[PDB]
Ligand binder design. Structure first.
Ligand SMILES: [Zn+2]
Lengths: 193, 4
């Protein structure tokens, strides 16, 4: 209880709510799901001044993502869609459309905000560990075992982010990851130590 | 960096 509360306190210094009208209850639900992430990662995101921006409109309607209008995201080739249609972005920043958390809401992640925040942890906190030799070996064996083989199975950083989301979303996804991807699960367990 |  106290650890979840500490994580919510840390997130209060990371999450940026949109100006204007937005679904406050769903924004709170997204923060609560993010609070399941191990506090060491959250504290490191705060120290690096990473902001998790929750949005009520399209990502590319924000001034800082306007440059992505018409750009085809990695792994979205052939879909006829561009960044204008993507609900969640992670990496050097994090930007997330409120209401689009669940799989199928314009994206394929088990949870939008955990997946995007995993990219920021990978890139900012862990210095692109998903592209390290160690993780590439794990990805070579287990990277297709969550499905979405043309996305998760092709880009190790995507398999990392999705695995991270399974690890932290809830007890069921955590158990599913352990059964499907035992080496990835052990990798994530050891990373948090 | 950006990722979907
Ligand atoms: Zn991703």
């Amino acid at each position: 209880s106290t650890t979840i509360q500490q994580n919510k306190d840390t997130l209060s210094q990371i999450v940026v709510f949109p100006t204007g009208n937005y679904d406050k209850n769903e924004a709170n639900a997204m923060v609560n799901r993010l609070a399941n992430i191990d506090g060491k990662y959250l504290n490191a995101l705060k120290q690096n001044n990473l902001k998790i921006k929750l949005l009520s409109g399209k990502l590319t309607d924000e001034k800082e993502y306007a440059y992505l209008k018409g750009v085809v995201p990695k792994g979205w080739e052939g879909t006829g869609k561009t960044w204008d249609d993507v609900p969640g972005l992670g990496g050097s920043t994090v930007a997330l459309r409120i209401g689009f958390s669940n799989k199928g809401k314009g994206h394929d992640a088990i949870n939008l905000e955990l997946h995007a925040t995993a990219h920021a942890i990978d890139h900012i906190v862990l210095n692109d560990i998903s592209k390290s030799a160690q993780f590439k070996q794990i990805f070579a064996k287990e990277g297709r075992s969550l499905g979405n083989v043309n996305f998760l199975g092709v880009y190790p950083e995507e398999f990392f982010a999705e695995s991270f989301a399974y690890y932290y979303l809830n007890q069921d996804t955590n158990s599913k990851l352990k059964s499907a991807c035992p080496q990835t699960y052990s990798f994530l367990q050891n990373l948090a130590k | 960096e950006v990722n979907p």
